[PDB]
From Swiss-Prot, chain C:
Native organism taxonomy: Eukaryota, Fungi, Dikarya, Ascomycota, Saccharomycotina
GO cellular component: mitochondrion; nucleus; proteasome complex; proteasome core complex, alpha-subunit complex
Chief localisation class: cytoplasm
UniProt name for this protein: Proteasome subunit alpha type-1
Entry keyword Nucleus: yes
Cross-link (Glycyl lysine isopeptide (Lys-Gly) (interchain with G-Cter in ubiquitin)): 222
Swiss-Prot record, chain E:
Signal peptide (UniProt feature, chain positions): none
Protein's name in the database: 26S proteasome regulatory subunit 4 homolog
Function, in words: The 26S proteasome is involved in the ATP-dependent degradation of ubiquitinated proteins. The regulatory (or ATPase) complex confers ATP dependency and substrate specificity to the 26S complex. Has ATPase activity.
Similarity comment text for this entry: Belongs to the AAA ATPase family.
Natural source organism: Saccharomyces cerevisiae (strain ATCC 204508 / S288c)
Subcellular location: Cytoplasm; Nucleus
Gene: RPT2
Curated annotation (Swiss-Prot), chain H:
Subunit structure comment from the entry: The 26S proteasome consists of a 20S proteasome core and two 19S regulatory subunits. The 20S proteasome core is composed of 28 subunits that are arranged in four stacked rings, resulting in a barrel-shaped structure. The two end rings are each formed by seven alpha subunits, and the two central rings are each formed by seven beta subunits. The catalytic chamber with the active sites is on the inside of the barrel.
InterPro entries to which the protein is assigned, alphabetical: Ntn_hydrolases_N, Proteasome_alpha, Proteasome_alpha-type, Proteasome_asu_N, Proteasome_sua/b
Modified residues (Phosphoserine): 14
Covalent link Glycyl lysine isopeptide (Lys-Gly) (interchain with G-Cter in ubiquitin), residues: 191
Similarity-based family: Belongs to the peptidase T1A family.
Official protein name in the record: Proteasome subunit alpha type-6
Keywords: Cytoplasm, Isopeptide bond, Nucleus, Phosphoprotein, Proteasome, Ubl conjugation
One GO-annotated biological process of the protein: proteasome-mediated ubiquitin-dependent protein catabolic process
Note: Present with 7210 molecules/cell in log phase SD medium.
Function summary: The proteasome degrades poly-ubiquitinated proteins in the cytoplasm and in the nucleus. It is essential for the regulated turnover of proteins and for the removal of misfolded proteins. The proteasome is a multicatalytic proteinase complex that is characterized by its ability to cleave peptides with Arg, Phe, Tyr, Leu, and Glu adjacent to the leaving group at neutral or slightly basic pH. It has an ATP-dependent proteolytic activity.
Swiss-Prot record, chain I:
Gene3D superfamilies per the UniProt record, alphabetical: Glutamine Phosphoribosylpyrophosphate, subunit 1, domain 1 (3.60.20.10)
Protein name, UniProt field: Proteasome subunit alpha type-4
One GO term (biological process): proteasomal ubiquitin-independent protein catabolic process
Family membership noted in the UniProt record: Belongs to the peptidase T1A family.
Gene: PRE6
Pfam families according to UniProt: Proteasome (PF00227), Proteasome_A_N (PF10584)
Predominant localisation class: cytoplasm
Residues recorded with modification Phosphothreonine: 60
Superkingdom, natural source: Eukaryota
Keywords from the named record: Cytoplasm, Nucleus, Phosphoprotein, Proteasome
Other information: Present with 16800 molecules/cell in log phase SD medium.
Cellular component aspect of the GO annotation: mitochondrion; nuclear outer membrane-endoplasmic reticulum membrane network; nucleus; proteasome complex; proteasome core complex, alpha-subunit complex; proteasome storage granule
Keyword Aminoacyl-tRNA synthetase assigned: no
Job description of the protein: The proteasome degrades poly-ubiquitinated proteins in the cytoplasm and in the nucleus. It is essential for the regulated turnover of proteins and for the removal of misfolded proteins. The proteasome is a multicatalytic proteinase complex that is characterized by its ability to cleave peptides with Arg, Phe, Tyr, Leu, and Glu adjacent to the leaving group at neutral or slightly basic pH. It has an ATP-dependent proteolytic activity.
Amino acid sequence: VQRTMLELLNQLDGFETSKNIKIIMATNRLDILDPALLRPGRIDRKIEFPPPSVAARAEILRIHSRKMNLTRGINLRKVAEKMNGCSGADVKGVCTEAGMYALRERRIHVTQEDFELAVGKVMNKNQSVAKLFK
Amino acid sequence: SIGTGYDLSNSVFSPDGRNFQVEYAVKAVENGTTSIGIKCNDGVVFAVEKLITSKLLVPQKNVKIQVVDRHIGCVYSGLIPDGRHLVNRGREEAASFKKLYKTPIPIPAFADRLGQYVQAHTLYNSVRPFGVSTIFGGVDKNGAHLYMLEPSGSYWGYKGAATGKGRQSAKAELEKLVDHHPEGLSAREAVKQAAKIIYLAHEDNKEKDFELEISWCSLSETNGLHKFVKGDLLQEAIDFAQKEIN
Amino acid sequence: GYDRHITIFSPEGRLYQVEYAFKATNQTNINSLAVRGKDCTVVISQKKVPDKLLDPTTVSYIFCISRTIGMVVNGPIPDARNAALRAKAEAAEFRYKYGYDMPCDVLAKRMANLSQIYTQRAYMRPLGVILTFVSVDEELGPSIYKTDPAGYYVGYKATATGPKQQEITTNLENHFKKSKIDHINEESWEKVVEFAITHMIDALGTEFSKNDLEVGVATKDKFFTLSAENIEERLVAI
Amino acid sequence: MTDRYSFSLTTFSPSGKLGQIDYALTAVKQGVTSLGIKATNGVVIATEKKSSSPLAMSETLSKVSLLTPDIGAVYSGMGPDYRVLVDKSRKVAHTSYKRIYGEYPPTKLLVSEVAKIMQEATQSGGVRPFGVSLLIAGHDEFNGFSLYQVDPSGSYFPWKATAIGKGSVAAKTFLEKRWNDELELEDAIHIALLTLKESVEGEFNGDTIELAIIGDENPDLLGYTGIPTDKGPRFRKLTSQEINDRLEAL
Amino acid sequence: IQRTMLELLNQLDGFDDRGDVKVIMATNKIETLDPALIRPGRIDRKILFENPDLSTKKKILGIHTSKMNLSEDVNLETLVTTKDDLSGADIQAMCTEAGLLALRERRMQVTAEDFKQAKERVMKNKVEENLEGLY
Amino acid sequence: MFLTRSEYDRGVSTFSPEGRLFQVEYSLEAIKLGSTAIGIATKEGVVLGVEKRATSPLLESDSIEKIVEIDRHIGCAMSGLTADARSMIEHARTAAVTHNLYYDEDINVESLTQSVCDLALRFGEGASGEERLMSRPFGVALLIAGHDADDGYQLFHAEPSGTFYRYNAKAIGSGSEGAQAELLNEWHSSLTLKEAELLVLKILKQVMEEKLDENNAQLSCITKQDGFKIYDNEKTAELIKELKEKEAA
Amino acid sequence: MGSRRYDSRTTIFSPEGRLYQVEYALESISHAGTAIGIMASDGIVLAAERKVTSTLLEQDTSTEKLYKLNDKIAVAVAGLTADAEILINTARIHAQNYLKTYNEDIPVEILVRRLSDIKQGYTQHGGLRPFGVSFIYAGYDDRYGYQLYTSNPSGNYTGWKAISVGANTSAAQTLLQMDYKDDMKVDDAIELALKTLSKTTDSSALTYDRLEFATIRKGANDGEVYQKIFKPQEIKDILVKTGI
Amino acid sequence: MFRNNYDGDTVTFSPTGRLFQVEYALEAIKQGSVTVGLRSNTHAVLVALKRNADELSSYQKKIIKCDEHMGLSLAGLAPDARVLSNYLRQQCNYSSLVFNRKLAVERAGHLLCDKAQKNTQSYGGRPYGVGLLIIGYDKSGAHLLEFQPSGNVTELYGTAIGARSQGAKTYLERTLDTFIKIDGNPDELIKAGVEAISQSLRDESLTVDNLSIAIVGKDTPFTIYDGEAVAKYI
Amino acid sequence: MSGYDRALSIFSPDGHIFQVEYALEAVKRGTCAVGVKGKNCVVLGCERRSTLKLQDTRITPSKVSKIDSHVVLSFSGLNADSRILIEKARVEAQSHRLTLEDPVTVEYLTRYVAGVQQRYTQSGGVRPFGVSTLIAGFDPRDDEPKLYQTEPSGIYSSWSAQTIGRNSKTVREFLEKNYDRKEPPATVEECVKLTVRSLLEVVQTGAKNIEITVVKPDSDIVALSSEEINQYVTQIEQEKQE
């Protein structure tokens, strides 16, 4: 079924196969499957999503932060300086339980203190002196 | 050590602590000629089945025995040449003893040498063990002795001995004989008592004939030196032992 | 490799070979024991005899290497003598060089340290044996030491060895917690012998002769085997 | 005779991490616990033995060992591969430094040459490494008190307060909190002592433990009094009651 | 599936008198997959394609852009080299990547640097080996 | 068994499971994979001949050397490989001068090759009890040739297996059998040097992969008068010249 | 013996025509630390980014990603330090040998073709591994003035301008490939280093304990160069002058 | 069938006890040609035929001098013979300038038997794969011995080896009490010791050059009758 | 593997010996090179694979490598092994000049360094020299030009031109076309424009990459200046006008 779709785009419909159909594709681990598929035939741009930058993560933290509350007393970027390149996907995580931690004690109003907490919630527990190398 | 295992190469203790490259050897000697060693009450005597494998062989021409410096008789079994090797070491080292300490060689300290040269061919990886089962017995001021030899070095001091393809057969008589003689026989009479063995042991191999040879060493008969026996002595024996087994 | 040779460990963090060499020591189903005194020690080793052609004076697991010193082996013989021989040859060195005779401790600081070397450079397989010693030194008194295929040599108050060094000891440590003594009394070289024989037969319950057992005692400028007619002196008890 | 100069351990696996090294220290972690720390005015090292059977004496087997009157060390790993290399080590200090100069060596470089005992073994033909990662403590005059770890490769690190062995990680996780930048000795030994007692069951008898220090000279032990240019041996261990009276304090 | 092979393996050669036919095929890898069906009684020969030579590559691409502007003349002959073992087909990609780079323009304008920005780009994805031993 | 060779090839000094050891025979093949040679017995002289594998038109083919003298009155050809052949030459000619020093006469030829064919058994075992010098055997079938007193005009055929036979004519290369047949039914007992030199070329025009000239074969002669030498191209371009009329029909 | 002691995989080739143990070793380094070395007109520098940074680990007495050879040459080691203290013990003698017979100091092009020729020496002879190492060099002479070199575990040395090694380096060059002029005074070099290292590593916090570097100059007119390894306080000076 | 291991080297016993490589050596000589002989009380003989490659080529040399009071033949590999021969000349030479009470035959076997032993236990090396025949003469008279790579030297009247040999030894066993009773008639036992070699072969023409003999006795020094002087003895 | 004859010893059933053909199968991955001898001159050439403009231009370890005033050496592929052959050749030069009181030939030199490799592939515990080299230069007081090519199997074979390494087969066919044993180039500049032109197919007009010497009678050795080269790189391209 990979052998057919590869040809389904070529030499029988190939005059019009990829004419006006304009596929995309989303994966991980590009370096294990066939090299037949990634090539200019059937593909154009092996483009890439790295983790974000410090400036990126501020935006992405500011945006799942929308609907929370009539908050105050915040500078929501220094958290990004607390937090190295992890993802622009998990930060909703630390954006989430910050509310929960205050929800846990019923103050619907929020604080910077919780962001300091929830950020440390995830990876400090997700953590060998054999440095034979120099 | 059945396959994908350990028996193939030396100095690898199989997990029951064994060198299965060794215990293959004792089957080799078990697949060889017969020979014996007896303690007279005043010395020793040996024997062997020489093996006619053809008609073109000459009596008293190709022995199966060598000898130590002056006294210590030594026999072979299983494989001859590997035996012949260390007997060159036998005559060798005993001269290093004699030149140095100004006397002949005692037999216990002798095995203290020859019971290690073979042991020191067990422990490496790039050698083979001597596929034999040797015997040597002799005389000294402290009396006489007999020593059997196993390739792993498990040499003890016997009064009677055996090897070859006729062990349980032969050694039975050696046990069934000695209990009837706690005295310990003198020399000339144990001879025919032993030739009784070989013309009985060969019962396995009745496809063929054979012959034998004899050793001799005692105080009252050689001053305690080694030699063979000829003339009417052993000829009076071979017919005797052949006479009293029919 | 990793399961055949020695000089490469397992992935785990140990090896497998030498753990076997300890095992061949039990390849003769023999038991032994050794004890102390103010001036005396004892060693013993039950002797088996298959087919009766042997010369039981020639049979021996014991090698009095020198004056002041004594040893007995375990496991098989031929891989023991070479461990005994260079021992004997060594006392022709320490004496000729450092004046006087070897204590045990320097010896079982030495005869082991090369057994370690027999498991770095694997060209020589390690000697298939655990091995003991006895003596009556001058500073520390009658001292015992144990040795082994890899060298955790240790002094002792007493020992136990064979296939059954789990309960023979239990028949012994039972009362060195009671009598409150590493030492043992009845100093003379007889009375301590029956102690060694009575407690083991209490652990075994088998009768003997001079034929099947032996003796070895460390004494000043002395070490030797002897006649074991004193099997009788146990008889007077019950 | 010995036809096996074939270099063991010389086969880099494709990841680049060697084979037996990462297996060798798989032992030392499986081995017993030890430690040794540092202060401003003195040093200490200690561990425990695990006799493993009662009748065996437990004072002849000195796990701690001397190599100079100013240096002393301990391990926790394999035993018989320790007592052989010290005999090389202390021999070196007579040879490589003393006979040629006269003095005893500093410890910026004794450890270096003790490392060279080790890498020459993980690189020649058919030789396993020594299953030990020991540590030494010593005193000098360009640097005074000091401490060093080693490892069966050869990489020596310096340290301040360290454990290696079974539960060392728990101890390294322990020291640094109740440690102090100037924890002088008689509290050091305490925190050191209890630093082990958590790491052990069975019994904590005073005879169970050895330890020692490098402090200040003690020419009551020097014997040959009558020479002002003969300072005291700065190293000296302790017996089993003067440990067992700091122990009654807890 | 084996039965799907047999009759065809049969229908091929079971047919004789191929006065007119040419039953042919092709793939991307054979050296570990196909049977030992090969016999001139069944199949005769086998002919290879693979990566091109430089002068082979030289025939390729102005002819593409012959149907294209080249606002300016940008000496493509020094653009590529035999050392970079391109595909044969990253080059129509090249030819359009630059107009894409003019699709990153209001200018519909041809430039050498656009090709420069492309092969630097596309080969950032393509592999590269270590010149460790300088072998 | 299933694999008699592959399961016992890697053991250089190991006899087969059927008797004839291996790495010698693996060493006895590649002589064919190289380039042929040929030589002939004769009482008024001796001839040798080869090809030279004119690979490209850049190689100055006078520079290649499948042929060389040992001494004044001995010459050797080669085959197969050539890097592994200098060493025997550099040992072989050493004996002749030495024989011309310790004994001061001229050396025989049968007293030579024995001290050449022994040399290629140092691997595994040794010749006169000595242990070993070199890893592997080395494959070049040589063709010595030389006058002497006791026997006159001779040749031998070396072989790394340690064997050698006093052929009266013998070839090398993959074309050996393809021609050695042709010589067997052609070699008489009372021929001349020249017609032999005319003979040998018949094979080279026959066997060779391409049309030959000066720069595709060369030759070398023997005389008790001159000893040993070779033939330059124009001389080679003359025995081939008047070759043809003998095959005009 | 041979059939079971794999002494064959060393010092041999692929069928595709290459080596394994070396392409492994050259890769094996990249698990290790990181260092750089450049060539300013005024003088020379180096640097090293450790990774061993346990807080109680003493990291202030002496150093391990950097060593010396003599009074005018220095290096920046990378590899495993059990395989560094030997050839260095073979290098330091070499200067104390070259002087000892020619009463001058080393033309620095000569010794790297004395150190490389023991690294090569093992990956042809024997069945031994190579030294798993890569070096930097930094030295001065008169028949070439300043210099800088780079080596490998095989034995292939190279002269280079401004280099990184160890980890994550192929971008590091590409992080500076724009920034390297040729004027290059000293105090506009160190700004590149931190601008290099502070954009590639684990934690941008970058405690001084996790950093070492050195320097070379010409401070006495018509005089030798000043070997100076910097020590913590003066390391920390420029560390914060930059404002980080 | 199926592969065996334990052959890879000359050091491993089999599970039974064989040195499986050794037998593969001894394989070659039955795979090789024949060289035989017999004994008189005053004389004793070697004889062996030849091989070739083509008719252009000469034949192999197969019987080799070692002294006047000894000589030998071979059947198998050519190199190993020279090793022993170039070795063997030395001892019969060595005794002739140190004791000059000339070397006897039997002890020669008893030391080169021990040659092969040393080269059949170690690793690095290889077994000399030949079973050769040998003669001699001494105060004890003439003799005849046999060789194997095992080290099993055996003193005998006569013997055959090589391919197609069985009938010839079998002829000899059938013809035993006759050829040896003679003395001073060397040229008649050979006439039985040739038709012996007429047992199993093709030889459809004048075997003039295919064949060679030497002999010694109480008077006869070791000399190899070769060439057409042999042709009468056909 | 002290001794051990690992697989260098093991011949093939085809006849070859694996690790040798493997070697010069590895050599082609390295920088090309070239040699020419004309009427009176001898010429050489190499390349520098493209660096990032950091590969130190001043003291690069180059491909030409002198021996004396009258001999040089160029090579291909591996480099750490190149540096010893260059040493234990010129060693023998200073020696040969001494104990014979007169300098080397070239037919004495190629025999050595082509014979050495055979010992590094017919011995134990040794890997071959994964390298291929050529020699170039005159004998003393002789106008004759000579170059000899040699490769790890140990054979040396003279030439008039030859190329080694990468994409040589893309090149040497150009040279057999132009160069001919008919008639040399006249003199120096003739060989060079012929020499350089042949490279250009693998060159991307990197004039910096390529580096050249010549050799002349009376040992007038010299390397040439990038400007002198580059002004050939262009006028040759000026001739492209068709």
